[PDB]
Enzyme design. Structure first.
Site, PDB file in Angstrom:
ATOM      1  CE  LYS A  20      22.822 -20.469  59.973  1.00  0.00           C
ATOM      2  NZ  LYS A  20      21.670 -20.100  59.505  1.00  0.00           N
ATOM      3  CG  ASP A  50      13.811 -22.807  62.564  1.00  0.00           C
ATOM      4  OD1 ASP A  50      15.471 -24.497  62.636  1.00  0.00           O
ATOM      5  OD2 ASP A  50      14.223 -22.292  62.372  1.00  0.00           O
ATOM      6  CE1 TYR A  91      17.914 -16.332  58.948  1.00  0.00           C
ATOM      7  CE2 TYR A  91      15.923 -17.726  58.338  1.00  0.00           C
ATOM      8  CZ  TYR A  91      17.796 -17.144  58.360  1.00  0.00           C
ATOM      9  OH  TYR A  91      18.189 -16.987  56.483  1.00  0.00           O
ATOM     10  NE  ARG A 148      11.174 -31.716  39.385  1.00  0.00           N
ATOM     11  CZ  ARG A 148       9.809 -31.829  39.116  1.00  0.00           C
ATOM     12  NH1 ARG A 148       9.133 -32.443  40.023  1.00  0.00           N
ATOM     13  NH2 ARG A 148       9.861 -32.210  37.878  1.00  0.00           N
TER      14      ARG A 148
END
Lengths: 380, 380, 380, 380
Positions: free
Chosen positions: C195, C170, C98, C46
């Site tokens: 994407k 973005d 979005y 992590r």
């Protein structure tokens, strides 16, 4: 350290460079060469890579061998090891071998002038009788599927040694935890890691180990040359599975023993086949070469009718062709492993239409016994 | 639809049950049987599973065949296809074959009474001369490594057909995008998917396709029986790689052609080997059976000294044994693929100590040409 | 070297220790510490690990930043970057953001005293008007979904800079290949790697890059503290996808431009939205801040009736919520991305029931244009 | 059926469509919609997919809940569950909480007007004293790290219920096998699946379960909205790990109990902290809410000098920050988990420089005890 400690305490417990407690997945086919003349530890993934190398060393360690070899499947390991023979060579092999081994000897290696005789490897005399001048290999699978007949590995090996013939042992059923064929005189030990070693029904894999550096060079050469290698991501799943092999098999073997004793005393059960029953032929031989009877048993109901009733009522086991899973597996050998045989060949191997094999998983033994009780209640 | 559309628009573009645009990874060795008598589509992962099945159908589609077969490695696909022969059978094979193919014919199948003669498959007469009454196979690899010699697939196939002998073609270098051996009379087409098909140097894989349902039954039988299968997680990486095969190879092949033309005009370069050069023997044959010269070229500097200087100065290419990566790869065949040959065998194949192979990746062609310019500047 | 070379020629082209051309998958949560006092490069997966570290450095390199951050999803990257704000802080944000970004600002950060106003970021005056004394962030998404409206990144950034407010962009739609917000005055650049970056519809992933070492410390702290990290096996799929980003996007963007020009001249098409059309508002701004119009376009048929007829007839595109795949994707924003809005909110954003978005994949442009021709033939 | 049977016998034991005994890995971000109006079970992987759905249902089953939620990490599960609070809300939390939980309450949620008081949750009076009118949450972690202090879940829950405040319990240490907080009055149960659930140190993962359908809607909404989801390939590793949770934890817990008893009687050991020792405060409370003391213990040597000598000599355990592995892990909390505290804060929590934590793995208990014997031999 005992073998259950060695599953965790070995060369791969912590990566040198990073401390990683798991071997990184080398999803790489190509390795950059930093020098024109010398090549670096790795040139090409098929030839070798760090993930496969760790699995190969760890299975060699568990079986007490010098080199290990990871293959795309147990049958690829078995097939590659047979390429150690040449045309003219003869093979004495167990009449009860895995169907895949049967098919490769009878349909493939027969076209290359490798001949065979199928024998009861539990009968040292019948073995002795069918020896030929060109006999190069004895092929042992103990205990046998699905009646769990036992072969005396030490005695078969001694006979093989006496004519400079090789011994191969398929040790899939007991794993290195319970049986170490290389210490008993075998030259090659073979595994379907697909079964108990990986243990989670999620990867297809084969292993071979040897103790002799010449055989190691020859098998390593054949592993590379035919190329039936285990991919690194599959090696990783086998490495992960190996870490629980002791806690999985100790639990499944102990519960298999309790279920064998319970089935042997049920009035609707005709026969139980399990090498941990004192009345099982091979009981003595099993105890002399192995430290457990294992996690697989077979049993016969009264008729094919009872068997079909039982299957319709049991809830816990999966119904499948395979074994060695964390889920309990019931198999119907007459309809699965041995469907393709003649009725006569099944009658000779004792493979009746009343017989089921159980591979014991990790379910509560009391839930398994109750589920069997309940299903047997609707029979007879 | 053209083949570049078929890479995406096929049976596996959307999962029926869920709409999944990628084929799920079936990391399962065991399938539960819901019926005692009939088995369900899958019994056992080695025998078949949905991830492998999709890769097998898609490569059959790309090559114009009826069935595809996925293997643990290209050499496992080649080795399995040779098990179609029996002892007594004779093989005519390219003297320039991949070293792994060379080794399996000379060191393994020679022990099983499968004989061979190595020939120039570019010389239809030398082929004709070495035919024998027991010749069952012609083994073609076009274009050849590392001089990219071209074999006339149609003419070799016709000759094979005329003695009821099989034709195998190793189509690794051009892929189904550029060359379709089954349409040219081959019986089996073989791929190292490790190379351009997967394209990312991250998985070892082999493919075979056939057009004849009898050969399909025999090869399918051998795939299962020897068991050198591609695992599902590896199938998934090959399936993912296939989706960019058109945009990767169109770019690399076009840039290989520009770099071949640029190297052929540099004063410090002695020879360029590329089937897209009009002066390359086989230029005509290549154009007649393929729609591109491909992404691999070789070239010779003035001396081994120039070659070592060039290697010390170039920045962009990786230096490795392999090809067909998204990273440009320089190889030194005299020190890698062909190190193990006699100097005489390398002299006959034209494999001098001045020769480099380039597998063109996805780098900017102008950066590759500049990087070569710069390195060649420190030579002569 | 151009950016298309940097996708392959970077620090991770060859592993130091082994030559591996792909970064090994560190499927490890725990790292052994060889010393009691000092810890080693890695303590805990992590916190950091070699696979994630390579993806983080490579996206920083592509965007021209100092540090990169890999997250479980694009929306986790966006959400983590918003934790840079505290209660009292105000956000100016694109009214076309979005839906996931919309939902996090309106339903989550609104409960923590982070306020917002939605604005047309393409109108520098409307932005200026709604500035408040506590405005700490300008949130830009260019080009916008699904009408591909363009925001002037340089001008919005200058305004933000003038009140010491942050700029987030973005940059999912164009990727670092085509648009570099950090060079245009943005402080944080955000990606759904799900994407185009990963490009194969097979992994969910988010990235953030920064150029300022203080913001890098704060975002790194939030990445670790909230823990919305990308797992190593998912990092590996993103790393693999990145290698084809240039050849994928160059092909899809070029074919999107041809299809936009073809749709703009079809008599059954009312509107085409694509920033590469000279008549598209923002054409000038797009050319000034980006090197391509990208791979996404939208178009309007005559009615909802035509649109439903078209969808019933087209064969090639997948029909899905997403974009940026190697398969062409048609979306119906009125029924997918924007279904949950009022009819009034859709009317204001120009999101009619006649509108389709196309994300162009790798199919032959002539097959896509024919498939559209054919489907449009059954309309009007 | 007991819980050890449910680990294997559940809805996912055999795939409907194929019989697959393992849940296929859906490495897909995009799902094709076969209808324009209705969407199909899956639209988008972040929103839901079959692999994550199986892990979510199985952890809900093990904890006796109605819904489960899989996250990128245990700290992401904890952080997401805290987003159930709004600014103004106050939290009573264990002063011994995991450092990651400590950091998120003190450094992140403090900037959003979520206030807290750290308390001894083992002191019902000190809890009662620090209640405020805006107290909405009680946060329990039992047993505590590294002294294994026990919180009375039933009593803390009753107090919380009495002011309509929520109870969260971090049940990482005991797992659902040994402790079921939802049956004891907790509203949310939280896991680092990274630890014992997955059990192999090879995946980072978090889980949350609830029993209330409103809380389930809110947490599901936050899982999707922040997007800190567990990827499908990571879900698969957790699903695989869960299958051995009973045989792993039964063995490790039993061996932890034997090692605790052996350490408590060694003359060079000052203190042992383990909830299975009759003299351990909380012994009674542990037995009333849990069916085992678990696999983690702590112990104190005579000095920091002895501790460093012991660490230099022990061979078997890994030395790491983490726990819950199949390999035994020794940790030094004063130098790892609690290094960042003041000496005063460590003195108050009893976290001396003589204290080690042991997470017991699957090594032979007799090899672990011998390895400790041997190392303790070089001390004092």
């Amino acid at each position: 350290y005992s073998i259950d400690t060695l599953l965790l305490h070995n060369q791969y417990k912590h990566d040198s460079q990073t401390g990683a407690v798991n071997v990184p997945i080398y999803n790489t086919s190509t390795f950059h060469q930093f020098d024109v003349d010398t090549f670096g530890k790795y040139d090409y993934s098929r030839s070798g890579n760090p993930t496969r190398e760790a699995l190969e060393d760890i299975i060699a360690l568990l079986e007490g061998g010098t080199k290990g070899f990871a293959f795309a499947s147990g049958i690829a390991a078995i097939s590659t090891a047979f390429l150690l023979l040449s045309q003219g060579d003869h093979v004495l092999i167990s009449e009860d071998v895995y169907g895949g081994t049967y098919r490769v000897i009878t349909e493939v290696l027969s076209r290359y002038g490798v001949s065979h005789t199928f024998v009861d490897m539990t009968n040292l005399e019948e073995i002795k009788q069918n020896i030929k001048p060109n006999t190069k290999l004895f092929y042992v699978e103990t205990p046998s599927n699905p009646l769990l007949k036992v072969t005396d590995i030490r005695e078969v090996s001694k006979l093989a040694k006496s004519i400079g013939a090789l011994t191969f042992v398929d040790n899939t059923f007991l794993t290195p935890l319970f049986q170490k064929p290389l210490e008993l005189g075998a030259d090659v030990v073979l595994h379907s890691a697909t079964k108990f070693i990986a243990g989670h029904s999620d990867v297809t894999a084969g292993l071979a180990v040897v103790k002799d550096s010449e055989l190691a060079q020859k098998l390593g050469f054949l592993q590379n040359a035919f190329g039936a290698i285990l991919g690194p991501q599959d090696c990783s799943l086998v490495l992960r599975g190996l870490k629980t092999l002791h806690v999985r098999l100790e639990h499944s073997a102990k519960n298999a023993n309790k279920i064998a004793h319970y089935l042997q005393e049920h009035s609707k059960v005709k026969n139980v086949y399990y090498p941990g029953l004192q009345t099982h032929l091979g009981f003595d031989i099993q105890q002399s070469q192995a430290t457990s009877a294992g996690a697989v048993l077979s049993f016969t109901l009264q008729s094919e009718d009872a068997l079909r009733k039982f299957l319709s009522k049991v809830k816990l086991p999966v119904f499948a062709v395979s074994l060695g899973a964390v889920e309990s597996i019931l198999s119907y050998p007459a309809k699965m492993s041995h469907a393709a045989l003649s009725q006569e060949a099944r009658d000779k191997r004792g493979i009746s239409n009343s017989l089921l094999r159980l591979s014991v998983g990790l379910e509560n033994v009391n839930d398994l016994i109750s589920d069997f009780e309940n299903a047997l209640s609707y029979v007879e």
